[PDB]
């Protein structure tokens, strides 16, 4: 009665594992993971057993594996005891005698084609599934991994890794002291809102994304999803200026890795071109909303109309003429603003150019700060800034990281755009300065959820996330302004369908 585990690497959507008798990919770290998971034992005198079909045995070239016993399931292969590293059995069920008969085996692993994966899943002897989710779907497969029965539950999901611009995860599925929790609950009954834990309750299982993953929430998309759950659990109802009521919690944080993946949310399809188009719009220092609507982008349409520019206190602006906004505060901080149809080249202080200069000539500094919150020009701008501050950091191994502070953040539509926007911005700065992308950390003040997004956000929490895509540039640019959408390649992006959330 030992431990039997399935080890497989399959595509994220199609769940394919092979093509023409070979692997569909060449991921060096995946094979390393295979060797480390199949050699992991406790007793030095026992060995681990690896079960595979004949075609899989032919697939790996009929060459043994060090420190492991290979069990091949075939009806034609000859059985000879001259090689103890390879053993041949006639069926999978009778090959599971390693627990009953052989006491020189600690753990068994099933890893051999769909013929064996199918039978092993139906026979109720497998206790665990080690799954590597490869983000490859362009090519075709002839052997697939069977669907995981409902009896297994995900317990671990690693961060996204990269190998030759290919993204992949690592997942575990499992077939499925205390006086502290009872003392904390009793303390929470005595003190009401006086105990801070009651103000920061853990979200209930009905609003927790993939609740069976209780300890292996390594995948950094959970940083956003779990923040979404915390607002749904203990968010306070707040009426506002109009009728769009929110639920707010104050002081939150989420961080993302940019060294091996691009944090583009996979639990819903995120329009990345419009995110990129608004970022270069910021970088170029532009304030004209018509430049955005001329590129099929309507993010700043409701905040720049004539009705919205006359009920806030203005009204003398053009049709879509936001005032000193993001970009004008990055490239021309302070400085007198006239209209949208002027050239502000050389006015104010250019924080972005000074940032690039300090990143390349003083990397170990601690003043790489880009602010967009100008209290003097708040009442002459269309909407006060939400990404009020961003600080950048050069690690010892030549990586550029980024901190972002947001006073405001709609989790429904704002956060997915801000995460990708400041990740692209950091990668763009990283290439210009000669660095590699590092980490991103988002600090949020008033994290809120609009009431008309509840049904829709509760659908996103029902989707198990997928590995992050890759974002790579084609050419190497000279200045930050020369970036265009033609230079961006989004690789391995396989999101769930869109979620129409109206603003």
Ligand X SMILES: CN(Cc1cnc2nc(N)nc(N)c2n1)c1ccc(C(=O)N[C@@H](CCC(=O)O)C(=O)O)cc1
Residues 6+ apart with CB under 8 A from 474: 486, 487, 488, 489
For the record, the structure tokens of 62 come out as 């009929």
By CB under 6 A, tell whether 113 contacts ligand NDP. yes
By CB under 6 A, tell whether 112 contacts ligand NDP. yes
The residues assigned a catalytic role are 386
196 contact, one of its own copies, ligand X, ligand NDP, none, CB 5-8 Å limit per kind: its own copies
CB 492 within 8 A of CB 167: yes
Residue from the set 60, 65, 99, 369 that interacts with its own copies by CB under 8 A: 369
CA distance 171 to 389: 36
**Cβ count within 10 A of residue 445:** 16
Q: Which stretch binds ligand NDP (CB under 6 A): 19-27, 182-190, 205-213, 330-338?
A: 19-27
Question: Considering only CA atoms, which of 27, 54, 13 is closest in space to residue 139?
Answer: 13
Question: Considering only CA atoms, which of 195, 156, 152 is closest in space to residue 172?
Answer: 156
Residue from the set 6, 18, 110, 428 that interacts with ligand NDP by CB under 6 A: 18
Question: Considering only CA atoms, which of 135, 116, 88 is closest in space to residue 7?
Answer: 116
CB 494 within 8 A of CB 137: yes
Residue 119 assigned as binding residue: yes
Distances (CA, A) of 446 to 8, 159, 171, 233: 43, 27, 34, 15
Residues 6+ apart with CB under 8 A from 357: none
By CB under 8 A, tell whether 130 contacts its own copies. yes
**Cβ count within 10 A of residue 502:** 10
Q: Which stretch binds ligand NDP (CB under 6 A): 3-11, 99-107, 302-310, 479-487?
A: 3-11
By CB under 6 A, tell whether 414 contacts ligand NDP. no
Query: Any idea what DSSP says for residue 247?
Result: E
Residue from the set 367, 474, 475, 484 that interacts with its own copies by CB under 8 A: 367
247 contact, one of ligand NDP, its own copies, ligand X, none, CB 5-8 Å limit per kind: none
Q: How far is the CB of 23 from ligand NDP (least distance, A)?
A: 5
Q: How many residues in the shown chain lie near its own copies by CB under 8 A?
A: 82
Residue 343 assigned as binding residue: no
Residue from the set 3, 13, 21, 306 that interacts with ligand NDP by CB under 6 A: 21
By CB under 8 A, tell whether 353 contacts its own copies. no
Run of H or E residues at 406: strand 399-410
Residue 135 assigned as binding residue: no
CA distance 99 to 46: 12
CA distance 483 to 476: 9
Question: Considering only CA atoms, which of 380, 146, 419 is closest in space to residue 266?
Answer: 419
Q: Which residues bind ligand X (CB under 6 A)?
A: 7-9, 23, 30-35, 52, 56, 59-60, 65-66, 111, 132
By CB under 6 A, tell whether 37 contacts ligand NDP. no
Q: How many helices (H) and strands (E) are present in the chain, helices listed first?
A: 13, 20
CA distance 236 to 456: 19
By CB under 8 A, tell whether 384 contacts its own copies. yes
Encoded one letter per residue, x for contact with its own copies by CB under 8 A and - for no contact, window 291-330 reads: ----------------------------------------
Residue from the set 443, 451, 477, 490 that interacts with its own copies by CB under 8 A: 443
Residue from the set 2, 41, 46, 55 that interacts with ligand NDP by CB under 6 A: 55
Taking the least distance from each CB to ligand NDP, the nearer of 53 and 348 is 53
By CB under 8 A, tell whether 446 contacts its own copies. yes
Residue from the set 114, 439, 449, 465 that interacts with its own copies by CB under 8 A: 439
By CB under 8 A, tell whether 66 contacts its own copies. no
Q: How many residues in the shown chain lie near ligand NDP by CB under 6 A?
A: 30
CA distance 22 to 334: 62
Taking the least distance from each CB to ligand NDP, the nearer of 95 and 460 is 95
Helix 222-234 × helix 414-433 angle, to 10°? 150
By CB under 6 A, tell whether 171 contacts ligand NDP. no
Encoded one letter per residue, x for contact with ligand NDP by CB under 6 A and - for no contact, window 80-99 reads: ----------xxx-------
- Summarize as ranges the residues that interact with ligand NDP (CB under 6 A): 8-10, 17-18, 21-23, 52-56, 59, 73-77, 90-92, 111-116, 119, 143
């Amino acid at each position: 009665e030992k431990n039997v585990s399935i080890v497989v690497a399959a595509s994220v959507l199609s769940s394919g594992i092979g093509i023409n008798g070979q692997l569909p990919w060449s991921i060096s770290e995946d094979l390393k993971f295979f060797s480390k998971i199949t050699n992991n034992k406790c007793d030095s005198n026992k060995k681990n057993a690896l079960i595979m079909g004949r075609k899989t045995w032919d697939s790996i070239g009929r060459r043994p594996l060090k420190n492991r016993i290979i069990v091949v399931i075939s009806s034609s292969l000859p059985q000879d005891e001259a090689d103890p590293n390879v053993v041949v059995f006639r069926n999978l069920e009778d090959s599971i005698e390693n627990l009953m008969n052989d006491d020189s085996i600690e753990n068994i692993f099933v890893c051999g084609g769909e013929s064996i994966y199918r039978d092993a899943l139906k026979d109720n002897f497998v206790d665990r599934i080690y799954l590597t989710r490869v983000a490859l779907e362009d090519i075709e497969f002839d052997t697939y991994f069977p669907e995981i029965p409902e009896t297994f539950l995900p317990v671990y999901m690693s961060q996204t890794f990269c190998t030759k611009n290919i993204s992949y995860d690592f997942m575990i599925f499992e077939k499925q002291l205390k006086s502290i929790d009872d003392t904390v609950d009793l303390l929470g009954e005595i003190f009401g809102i006086r105990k801070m834990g009651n103000r920061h309750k853990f979200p209930k299982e009905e609003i927790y994304n993939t609740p069976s993953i209780r300890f292996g929430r390594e995948h950094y998309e959970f940083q956003y999803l779990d923040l979404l759950s915390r607002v749904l659990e203990n968010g306070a109802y707040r009426e506002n200026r109009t009728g769009i009521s929110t639920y707010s919690i104050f002081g939150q944080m989420m961080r993302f890795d940019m060294r091996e993946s691009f944090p583009l949310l996979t639990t819903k399809k995120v329009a990345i071109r419009s995110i990129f188009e608004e970022l270069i719009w910021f970088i170029k220092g532009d304030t004209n909303g018509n430049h955005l609507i001329e590129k099929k982008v309507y993010i700043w349409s409701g905040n720049g109309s004539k009705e919205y520019l006359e009920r806030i206190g203005l009204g003398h602006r053009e049709e879509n003429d936001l005032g000193p906004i993001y970009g004008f505060q990055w490239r021309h901080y302070n400085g007198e603003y006239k209209t949208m149809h002027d050239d502000y080249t050389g006015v104010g202080v250019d924080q972005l150019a000074k940032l690039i200069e300090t990143l390349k000539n003083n990397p170990k500094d601690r003043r790489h700060i880009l602010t967009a919150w100008n209290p003097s020009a708040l009442s002459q701008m269309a909407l006060p800034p939400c990404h009020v501050l961003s600080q950048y950091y050069v690690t010892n191994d030549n990586c550029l990281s980024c901190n972002l502070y947001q006073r405001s953040c709609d989790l429904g539509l704002g956060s997915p755009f801000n995460i990708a926007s400041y990740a692209i911005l950091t990668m763009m700065l990283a290439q210009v300065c000669g660095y590699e992308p590092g980490e991103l950390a988002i600090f949020i003040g008033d994290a809120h959820i609009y009431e008309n997004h509840l049904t829709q956000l509760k659908e996103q929490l029902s989707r198990t996330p997928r590995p992050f895509p890759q974002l790579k540039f084609k050419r190497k640019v000279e200045n930050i302004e020369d970036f265009k959408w033609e230079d961006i390649e989004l690789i391995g992006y396989y999101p769930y369908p869109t979620i129409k959330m109206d603003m």
